[PDB]
Design a protein around this ligand. Structure first.
Ligand code: GDP
Ligand code: GDP
Ligand code: CA
Ligand code: CA
Lengths: 149, 149
């Protein structure tokens, strides 16, 4: 259920979003971050992830979101559950007039870089970063840095 | 902003998953608390106490608000044992049968002293402390509560 703009605005204004964030490792002990082109956390390096839709199972969401974010569909069985997190932003997808709140389910998994097809819709660049490098940069959003604390 | 007007809550339930905390509440003898629900969804079923997280509310704050509202006893989230992520889908909703309800649920288990609760009558018309074997044997205990045991 991909909502029309009016109803997505009302939803974001009124209730927490539920999302899956992906802690994606390569063959070198590095993790995938993309530089976000959408609000919230626009212009920051952030892990790939997205919200779960109405009446969508977590199993279905994991497949839809891995395909949408990484260009590679993976089943939820590939992910290692990595906690429940909470992300609060002062802005939203279409403005700076109300806040966004996510309750986030983290999942960690390792992939082969050559099997991904990284899309350009939500990020304008992608890097595989070591925990030390990502923790040392203010350009990586705090909500992504904490996964590596 | 937090407790929504009915109009806004209806839009939310129609359009996106709710995020809730369900409480697996044990007494000193190893029995667990179930209430007979007076509201939709799962109306008329025995169910664990629990409720949804509000916009811009931390999970820590929601746990305190919800234990107080559900049990008459405020407990901190540190008292709870994380008990998994679950998903509950219902064909009806708080206002009737016009649309479905979807919850992404964070389970928490903890023991209380029965004598210290002040069980409210707003959401349940009866309460029982049941053994796992007993609650598992009854179709009047909703499947979404039975699975915790
Ligand atoms: N109109 C609309 N936009 C959405 C919906 N869900 C997500 N979006 C937007 O679609 C894009 C991708 O969604 P998602 O990956 O879930 O969002 P993220 O938290 O920004 O990474 C972002 O620009 C979101 O703001 C929806 O139901 N309706
Ligand atoms: N108007 C309104 N009602 C709500 C809201 N959140 C929950 N409710 C209703 O308030 C009561 C208690 O909420 P909760 O414990 O979260 O619901 P449960 O899932 O039915 O146990 C139920 O009747 C819900 O339908 C809200 O933001 N606005
Ligand atoms: Ca995304
Ligand atoms: Ca409740």
């Amino acid at each position: 259920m991909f909502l029309r703009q009016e109803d997505f605005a009302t939803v974001v204004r009124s209730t927490p979003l539920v999302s899956l964030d992906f802690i994606v490792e390569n063959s070198r002990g590095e993790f995938l971050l993309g530089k976000r082109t959408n609000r919230p956390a626009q212009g920051y390096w952030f892990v790939p992830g997205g919200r779960v839709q109405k009446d969508e199972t977590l199993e279905a969401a994991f497949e839809r979101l891995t395909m949408a974010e990484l260009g590679l569909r993976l089943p939820i069985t590939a992910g290692q559950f990595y906690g429940v997190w909470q992300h609060f932003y002062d802005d939203n997808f279409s403005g700076t007039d109300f806040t966004t709140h996510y309750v986030v389910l983290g999942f960690r998994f390792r992939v082969a870089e050559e099997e991904l097809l990284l899309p350009d819709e939500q990020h304008d660049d992608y890097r595989w970063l070591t925990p030390d490098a990502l923790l040392a940069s203010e350009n990586v959003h705090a909500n992504s840095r904490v996964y590596f604390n």
